[PDB]
A paper describes a structure:
Additional studies allowed the cloning and sequencing of B cell receptors (BCRs) and permitted the identification of broadly neutralizing antibodies (bNAbs), which can neutralize most viral strains at low concentrations in vitro. Three potential bNAbs were constantly identified as CD4 binders (bNAb2101, bNAb4251, and bNAb1586) belonging to the VRC01-class and derived from the VH1–2*02 variable heavy chain gene segment.
To confirm the epitope and explore the binding mode of bNAb4251, we decided to perform cryo-electron microscopy (cryo-EM) of the antigen-binding fragment (Fab)4251 in complex with the soluble native-like trimer (BG505 DS-SOSIP). In total, fifty-one residues of the Fab interact with fifty-six residues on gp120, to bury a surface area (bsa) of 950Å2. The interaction is principally dictated by the heavy chain with 700Å2 bsa, while the light chain buries 250Å2 of the gp120 surface. The CDR-H2 makes most of the contact, totaling a bsa of 528Å2, a binding mode that have similarity to the previously described interaction of the CD4 receptor with gp120. Structural investigation revealed that Fab4251 possesses an angle of approach similar to VRC01, a result in agreement with its CDR-H2 mediated contact on gp120, indicating that it belongs to the same antibody class. Moreover, hydrogen bounds are also present between the heavy chain R53, K62 and Q428, S460 of gp120, respectively and a salt bridge between R71 and N368 of gp120. The CDR-H3 also contact the gp120 with N100 contributing a hydrogen bond with N279 in loop D of gp120, as it was already reported for other VRC01 class bNAbs.
Residue numbers in the entry:
A (entry chain H): 1 to 52, 52A, 53 to 82, 82A, 82B, 82C, 83 to 100, 100A, ...
B (entry chain L): 1 to 27, 32 to 68, 72 to 91, 96 to 107
The structure:
């Protein structure tokens, strides 16, 4: 019955740093690679990054480098995602995905983080 | 890079009719169900090893394709054929 949870939806002006939090309950946290992905609704999700809580090693994507920061706290088994220099064309939806066995892909999806900006 | 050859994303199946979704490329074949508003749920991982709580009708054609023997209300929604961290093309289903 392992599940994941995340914070609600936030609306703020573009150009401001955004921060979100995720947590996982019911499973071991050290050896499970977490993922953070975003999608424009009715389109193809683009993977943003992944983190390995066992040693904190992170990996990002091609269009998100220098604008992403991933932190993990296996102690409280919670993960923080903070993005700086937010642009206009990022009003999309975000999931904090969790993958079993620390392998690729992901199975458990979050509660639908909605990060939006207005012009 | 790699671009998956996907069949057109439109079907008219309603209830109890074997249809398939083409994702012809290498490998595997990770398929997910996208939910409207609700969080998405993965359907099959590895195209051959079903998990717990998923219907036995869901079958992946190895290095293909999610061949489903029929359509039921609990399996409606967009079907995504993801890969190692790239994606597919997607295929949304509906009942007519
Ligand atoms: C004779 O047999 C019957 C049936 O086989 C026995 O009755 C069953 O007893 C078990 C254990 O007492 C019970 O299972 C629990 O059910 C609870 C309610 O569904 C669950 O909450 C509980 O899970 C917690 O405990 C587990 C450890 O046992 C943990 O692994 C699990 O993660 C849960 O722990 C979380 O929650 C607790 C409390 O909230 C917290 O302290 C933890 O830190 C953690 O956060 C068990 O699954 C069955 O439900 C009983 N079955 C029935 C039908 O009642 C009966 O006990 C046997 N007779 C004797 C004498 O033993
Ligand atoms: C681009 C391609 O070859 N597609 C496969 C895909 O079917 C599979 O889900 C993934 C996981 O192994 O590997 C890749
Ligand atoms: C180097 C290698 O094994 N290539 C495969 C690739 O063909 C496939 O798309 C995917 C499998 O998940 O990535 C890997
Ligand atoms: C222990 O203290 C350090 C330094 O304050 C802190 O970073 C770490 O999270 C703490 N460990 C625990 C048990 O959370």
């Amino acid at each position: 019955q392992v599940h994941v949870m995340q914070s609600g939806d936030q609306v703020k002006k573009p150009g401001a740093s955004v921060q979100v939090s995720c947590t996982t309950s019911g499973s071991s946290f050290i050896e499970d690679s977490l993922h953070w992905i975003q999608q424009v609704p009715g389109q193809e999700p683009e993977w943003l990054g992944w983190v390995n809580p066992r040693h904190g090693a992170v990996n990002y994507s091609w269009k998100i480098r220098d604008r992403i920061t991933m932190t993990r706290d296996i102690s409280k088994s919670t993960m923080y995602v903070q993005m700086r220099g937010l642009q206009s064309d990022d009003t999309a939806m975000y999931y904090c995905a969790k993958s079993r066995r620390g392998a690729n892909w992901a199975l458990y999806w979050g509660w639908g983080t909605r990060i939006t900006v207005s012009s | 890079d790699i671009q998956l050859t996907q069949s057109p994303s439109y079907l008219a199946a309603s209830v109890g009719d074997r249809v398939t979704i083409t994702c012809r490329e290498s490998n595997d074949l990770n398929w997910y169900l996208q939910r409207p508003g609700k969080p998405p749920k993965l359907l099959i991982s590895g195209a051959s090893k079903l998990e717990r709580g998923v219907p036995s009708r869901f079958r992946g054609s190895s290095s293909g394709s999610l061949t489903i023997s029929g359509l039921q209300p609990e399996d409606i929604g967009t079907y995504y054929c993801q890969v190692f961290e790239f994606f597919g093309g997607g295929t949304r289903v509906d009942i007519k």
